[PDB]
Design a protein around this ligand. Structure first.
Ligand SMILES: *[C@@H]1O[C@H](CO)[C@@H](O)[C@H](O)[C@H]1NC(C)=O
Length: 355
């Protein structure tokens, strides 16, 4: 139970219910690498659905019941057997307690039942870590899964700008977005946005941004402009606007993408063609993403799972691809960084997770 909780010293930076946000840290002295991981877990976007989330997913809205430690797993493990890539790094797990895809900048107040402070939580964590050793860093990798992966895309350049303005231009900020690269595609079956379950992510995120006071990266904001900032929550639209190196991990048939497309799994022709087209579209969006790992599996998240080393694309595991990415940022013979499956159906890669 090896990462220790620190509640933020700035207690105006809060989870949804006004309790302090925080982070779990395991230092590795003498390492100048820092991994800051953003937890995922969907989002809520109005009073009613945030109230329901508060009843049955309260750890995602409050720190009051957080344990004092958490065990680092997968890319957060300190054992080389489990984490060939960054086992000796300084490890930070940032709990997701803002329900805003890490985008919010609004406090609980007279007018707001909940605080949505995800973008400010990340900034405050970075600020407080600087005094605990991050000031000596050479690389800060901001990683995250699901909504935390999208959170990487929305925040990595802001972390880079923050460190530059604080006088640390030597810290190289990079992103690792896992299972956060979604498509605003047509659903397999179609429902108008009449409640939470019928509301597609484009409409739910458009509402969320207003409810959260959500913020997006500046260059993407300037492209899409007022009322269209929801576009910046879709990886293929925001990624080309970013300056920081970002490695994208995305299952081609992500279970959360299928859920928001109203697919849940003998498959007949219409659905077969739908699923094949989804994988093709995902592969197309990654064509020109040089650092990516996109296996042809029906699954969800990878990087903090203990068996994250097992999956391979073209014979290369994700820890290997990440190591090759590090080398590339110092093509490399036998050390690839762009790994996208071409086979067209879930589990056509034999190394997919078994479930
Ligand atoms: C606390 O965080 C708030 C919100 O991000 C910020 O405005 C303020 O400057 C911070 N205060 C301190 C003392 O760091």
């Amino acid at each position: 139970e090896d990462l220790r909780l620190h509640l933020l010293l700035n207690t105006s930076v809060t989870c949804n219910d006004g309790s302090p946000a925080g982070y779990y840290l395991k230092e590795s002295r003498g390492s100048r690498r820092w991994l800051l991981f953003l937890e995922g877990g969907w989002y809520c976007f109005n009073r009613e659905n945030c109230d329901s989330r508060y009843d049955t997913m309260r750890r995602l809205m409050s720190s009051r019941d957080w344990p004092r430690t958490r065990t680092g797993t997968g890319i957060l493990s300190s054992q080389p057997e489990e984490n060939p890539y960054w086992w000796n790094a300084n490890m930070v797990f940032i709990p997701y307690c803002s329900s805003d895809v890490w985008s919010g900048a609004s406090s609980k107040s007279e007018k707001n039942e909940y605080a949505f402070m995800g973008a400010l939580i990340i900034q405050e964590v970075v600020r407080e870590l600087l005094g605990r050793g991050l000031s000596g860093a050479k690389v800060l990798l901001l990683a995250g899964s699901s909504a935390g992966g999208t959170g990487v895309l929305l925040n990595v350049d802001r972390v880079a700008e923050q460190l530059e303005k604080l006088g640390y231009p030597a810290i190289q900020v990079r992103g690792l977005a896992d299972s956060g690269w979604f498509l605003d595609n047509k659903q397999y079956r179609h429902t108008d946005c009449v409640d939470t379950i019928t509301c597609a992510p484009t409409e739910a995120i458009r509402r969320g941004i207003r409810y959260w006071n959500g913020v997006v990266p500046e260059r993407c904001r300037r492209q899409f402009q007022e009322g269209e900032e929801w576009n910046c929550f879709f990886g293929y639209k925001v990624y080309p606007t970013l300056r920081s190196p970002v490695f994208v991990v995305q299952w081609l048939f992500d279970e959360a993408q299928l859920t928001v497309d109203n697919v849940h799994l003998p498959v007949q022709e219409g659905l077969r063609l739908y699923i094949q087209n989804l994988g093709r579209e995902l592969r197309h969006t990654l064509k020109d993403v040089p650092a990516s790992f996109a296996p042809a599996c029906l699954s969800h998240e990878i990087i903090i799972r203990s068996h994250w080393t097992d999956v391979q694309v073209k014979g290369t595991s994700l820890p290997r691809a990440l190591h090759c990415w590090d080398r590339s940022l110092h093509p490399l013979k036998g050390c690839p960084v762009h790994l996208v499956d071409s086979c067209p159906w879930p589990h056509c890669n034999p190394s997919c997770p078994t479930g």
